[PDB]
Each structure stands twice: as C-alpha cells, then as structure tokens.
C-alpha cells in the first residue's frame, strides 16, 4: 500500500500493520538476470597459450518473492513468518578449475578455468513428513515431563513479586494514612536488629531509605521474572525437521573448445524443517505496535526506587509511586494476555537444498588427465511457505498456563487499587 513498504499496511486508526496478505501470499516473480555472464581460460594447450574470456551458460530462470518488512505479532512477539520463494528450474554452480597433464609426443596443457558454470537438474521435489511427524508427537508428549518444573518454578517467582508488590503497598498506605508507627513496623522485618530512633518523625525519608532492603528484593525478583517470562515463552515456538543427503550428477561438459571432457558428481543435502508458533489468538490481526511497551520500560520500573538522584521525592511523591504501580501493573496485565488464548498462529513449511563436496573426473580422448577444482554454488533450491495448521498439535497449553494467567491478573487488580 502506497505511503509503506511491502509488507506494511495501514489498520483502522492508521497503525503500522503487517499486510498479512502480502507476507504470506506474496506474488511470485521470475528472475533471468545473467549474474556470471564470463568465464576465464588462462594457461596453455598443445603449444597454443591461450588467453580468452568466454561467455557462459544463460537463460537463468528463478521465481522468487519480493523483499518485505514485518512489525511484532503480540505482546514482545517476534516477528511473524513470511513466505519466500527462491526456486530455480535448475541448479546452478561456478567452477575454478587446474586441469594439467603432461604425456605424449609434447602432448601437454596447464590451464586455469575460473568462473565457468554449468547446471543440474533439480531435486526440488521431496517431503520428510515421515521423519517429522514423529518428532513432533514426541516434543508434545514430552513437553509437560520437561518443562513442568521449569513453568512452576517461574509461576512461583510471579506469584512472590505479588507478595514484595503487596508489601510495598502496605508500606506506601502507611505513609498515605500519615501512621508513622505502622510505617516503621513494616520497615522493623528487614533488620534482624530492633531499633527505632525516632529523633524525629519523617514519613518519606523513612519510606524512600528505611525501605531499601525491599525495593532491592523487587528489583531483584522483577528482573528474574522477565527473564523467567521470555524464556517461557520461547516454549509456544516449536520446531521441528529432518535432512537427507541426495547426489546429482554433472557430466560431458566441455569448457575450452572440445579439447577434454570434464564429468563429477555433487553431493546435496535436502534439508526439510517444520516451525509452528503459539500465542494469543486474539492479538495477531491487529497487535498496534504503539500500545508495545519498549523492554527498557520494565527493566528501568525495576530499580527506580533505587534511582539515586530521583528529583520527584521531594515534590511530587504520591504521584511517583502511585504511577510506578500502574505501570507495572499495566505490563503485567499485558503479559497475562500472552497466557490467556492460546492457538498456533503462524508456522512454517521450509525446503531448501545445500551443497557438500563434490568429486571431478577429467578424460581426454579415452584417456584420464589431473584435474583440481574449487566448486560454489549459484543457484539452489529455498522454498519457505507459511502454514498456519498442523492436524498434530496435541497440546493444550490454555490449561497449562491457566494458572499464570490468574495470578497476573490479581496482581494487576491490586496495582490498581493503589490511590493518590
């Protein structure tokens, strides 16, 4: 859509949108364009030092897809999968040749090719689903045995920031009521040893430093549940694949006018790899990427009470507090939607064709001759394409994760009944 790159699109109130239609259902087109239009020969033949610069093999023919740009899919989503193409109707390759031989009656060549390609067929045809399928039933069936303690153990971490949030919130109504008493028995767990001056009554010096030991235990517990958090979702990805190897054979070309046949073999690895990716059902359609907090926000909550040089105490600390719990709350809530509605949304479907070693045979005239060769491919075989369905799926994470969400959203409520 014009005013935006490919797989951009304006939304309803003019967000940035990925154009889903584009990403997966891109129009295909074939590119011809010679990219290795020469190819050298520079040694000697038969006492004839030669010299040349040659064309070689044309009529590329590739279809292939146009490159786009993506935007996130849900709350920290990664970005989504989008279908490329890259086939070609044969496989190309260069080839930087020594051949050189010494018999005969001054029957003798050195020369250098470089640069000089040819084709193979392609083997673009082949599906693993036999190899996969079963790797995915057996990374479902597992899944619960080796994660569960894993997923529980950051459900308790979530649930202990609740107990620091509540805490606090106990601490910052006592400052609110103006019971300096209630303030310093909340103060009073963090030190084994009891004292209490009281040279004279400061409620929010007393807050801001008394309870240091508690926003020190936050900031810790915070950043453990983000990273407890972003390594649990990373478990909705799941990916799954299997490679073969496959031999083409290249045979009867003749660089340097017919003076020697070349013939080798090419060892492929067919490589099939099958991706599916869970997550809020809901907010893949229209996720607005302005309403994303940034990762720094969270990062930054954490320790602002540890902010040593933090002007807003002194003038305007109801407000400071207050806003600091619901920002916290407000990313809580949003992290709880990524436990709630749980579906595979995206996924793929990848082939693609890669090169291993390759072995040249040279024979002139009947008769074998030394060859040594360096090989690089040109052209070969990609075909990523999005699918949003695997018949497969067996698990059902909403009631796995059913107890996240329950807790992020209690924590969130109580965030909210703070009051200035």
């Given at each position: 859509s014009p005013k935006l790159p490919r797989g951009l699109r304006f939304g309803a109130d003019n967000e940035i949108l990925n154009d889903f239609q584009e990403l997966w259902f891109p129009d295909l087109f074939i590119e011809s364009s010679d990219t290795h239009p020469w190819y050298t020969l520079k040694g000697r033949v038969l006492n004839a030092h030669l010299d040349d610069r040659l064309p070689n093999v044309g009529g590329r023919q590739v279809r292939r897809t146009p490159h786009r740009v993506t935007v996130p899919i849900a709350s920290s989503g990664l970005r989504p999968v989008t279908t490329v193409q890259y086939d070609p109707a044969a496989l190309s390759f260069l080839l930087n040749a020594r051949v050189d031989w010494d018999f005969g009656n001054g029957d003798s060549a050195n020369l250098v090719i470089n640069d000089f390609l040819f084709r193979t067929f392609a083997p673009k045809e082949f599906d693993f689903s036999n190899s996969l399928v079963p790797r995915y039933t057996q990374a479902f069936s597992a899944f619960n045995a080796k994660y569960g303690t894993m997923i529980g153990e950051g459900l308790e971490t979530i649930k202990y920031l609740g107990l620091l949030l509540r805490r606090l919130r106990e601490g910052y109504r006592a400052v609110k009521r103006g019971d300096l008493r209630a303030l310093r028995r909340v103060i009073?767990?963090?030190?084994?040893?009891k004292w209490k001056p009281a040279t004279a009554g400061n409620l929010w010096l007393e807050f801001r430093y008394g309870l240091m030991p508690l926003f020190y235990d936050i900031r810790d517990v915070m950043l453990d549940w983000q990273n407890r958090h972003d390594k649990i979702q990373r478990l909705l990805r799941f990916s799954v694949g299997h490679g073969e190897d496959y031999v083409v054979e290249f045979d009867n070309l003749y660089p340097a006018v017919a003076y020697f046949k070349l013939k080798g073999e090419i060892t492929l690895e067919r490589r099939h790899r099958h991706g599916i990716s869970y997550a809020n059902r809901e907010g893949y359609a229209v996720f607005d990427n302005g309403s994303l907090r940034p990762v720094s926000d969270w990062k930054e909550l954490a320790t602002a009470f540890i902010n040593?040089?933090?002007?807003?105490?002194?003038?305007?600390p109801y407000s400071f507090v207050v806003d600091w719990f619901l920002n916290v709350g407000d990313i809580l809530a949003q992290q709880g939607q990524l436990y709630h509605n749980i579906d595979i949304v995206d996924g793929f479907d990848r082939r693609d064709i890669r090169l291993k070693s390759f072995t040249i045979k040279g024979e002139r005239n009947g008769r074998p001759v030394n060859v040594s060769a360096s090989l690089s491919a040109v052209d070969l075989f990609y075909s990523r394409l999005h699918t949003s369905?695997?018949?497969?799926?067996?698990?059902?994470?909403d009631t796995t994760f059913s107890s996240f969400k329950h807790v992020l959203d209690s924590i969130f409520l109580l965030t909210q009944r703070v009051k200035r």
């Open positions: 009073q767990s963090y030190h084994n040893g040593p040089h933090e002007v807003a105490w002194e003038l305007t369905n695997l018949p497969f799926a067996t698990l059902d994470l």
